[PDB]
Design a binder for this molecule. Sequence first.
Ligand SMILES: Nc1ncnc2c1ncn2[C@@H]1O[C@H](COP(=O)(O)OP(=O)(O)OP(=O)(O)O)[C@@H](O)[C@H]1O
Ligand SMILES: Nc1ncnc2c1ncn2[C@@H]1O[C@H](COP(=O)(O)OP(=O)(O)OP(=O)(O)O)[C@@H](O)[C@H]1O
Lengths: 209, 66, 66
Amino acid sequence: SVSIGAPQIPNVTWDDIGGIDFVKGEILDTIDMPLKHPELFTSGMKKRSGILFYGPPGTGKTLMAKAIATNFSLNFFSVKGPELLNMYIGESEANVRRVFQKAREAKPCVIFFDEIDSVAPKRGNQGDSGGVMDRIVSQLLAELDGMSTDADGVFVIGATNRPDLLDEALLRPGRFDKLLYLGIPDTDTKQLNILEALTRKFVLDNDVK
Amino acid sequence: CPLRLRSGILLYGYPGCGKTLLASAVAQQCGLNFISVKGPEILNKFIGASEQNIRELFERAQSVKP
Amino acid sequence: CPLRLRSGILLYGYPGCGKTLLASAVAQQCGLNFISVKGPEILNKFIGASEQNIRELFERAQSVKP
Ligand SMILES: Nc1ncnc2c1ncn2[C@@H]1O[C@H](COP(=O)(O)OP(=O)(O)OP(=O)(O)O)[C@@H](O)[C@H]1O
Ligand SMILES: Nc1ncnc2c1ncn2[C@@H]1O[C@H](COP(=O)(O)OP(=O)(O)OP(=O)(O)O)[C@@H](O)[C@H]1O
């Protein structure tokens, strides 16, 4: 990765975050089940497009993605939506194409777009001032749609806070199939696990209950 | 027939209805040069290359068999 | 300390309430590399440039001591 770039993974693991009880099965099936069972799964059928998060902000979505990348140790790159946009159209599309193709060179790998909302909105809804995004989003679509044909070992993950503005072309399975969620913990057990993970490293006095 | 045959037809319909596949697949069935193109690949930030990009695509197309 | 320490803090109050003076003074009171930037200066009518300037300012920040 260093030769290729992104060392992003600082430090994370399952113990470092709670509330993963229900999602664990789905994410693990989407990620490692093919890894542990690739040849068996070699039936030339549609692989799971990827993952898509949403919900209240600060719900650990980005931490969750980093934990996935670290625990399963697949080549990772973080794409900050606004960093892509250039002064005029086109060169942003070139940036998207080059990043995706270099990822397709480094296989198998994991790719995640941070705050997809700001680079994959519903074009037309907001006042189209320049129509710049219309074309960038177009990029992602086909390169997402062109992933399954050959790019095996690469899967997409998305983080959102206002998913009501996402362009619908993405939501289709093949483009996006698992619309995973991470929101407020409902039952006291959720916060209990999240807290024991939160204070896992604390040097606490026994008074802590 | 001294008539130019119908060769350009547009595809549209419900999103994710399969048009992408059928487009890719028909190449092998009929058997031809399917020079696929990515929309954003043509448009170039810089003038003097977009028209050049489409022109080069067309020169590729003709320079190969039908 | 196993937890990342609260790093960023915002300021907000009455106009001309010395917020600028406090920000200027904290540079010497503690003693560090005081990276300074205004509001409009980052924004430029060239798209990309507005986010690009803040990104490279953060690159500069990562370049030096705290
Ligand atoms: N068990 C936990 N689950 C989730 N977040 C936790 C947990 N314990 C602590 N946190 C805190 O919650 C925050 C998670 O924010 P995170 O970086 O994941 O942003 P995000 O919600 O993905 O961002 P955005 O919604 O702005 O796109 C951090 O401040 C983290 O310390
Ligand atoms: N009879 C069928 N023939 C072909 N594909 C079918 C059929 N029934 C269902 N499908 C499925 O429809 C899906 C639609 O995918 P595809 O990307 O080709 O759609 P599309 O409508 O052309 O969308 P887009 O314009 O966004 O590329 C295909 O993945 C295919 O598996």
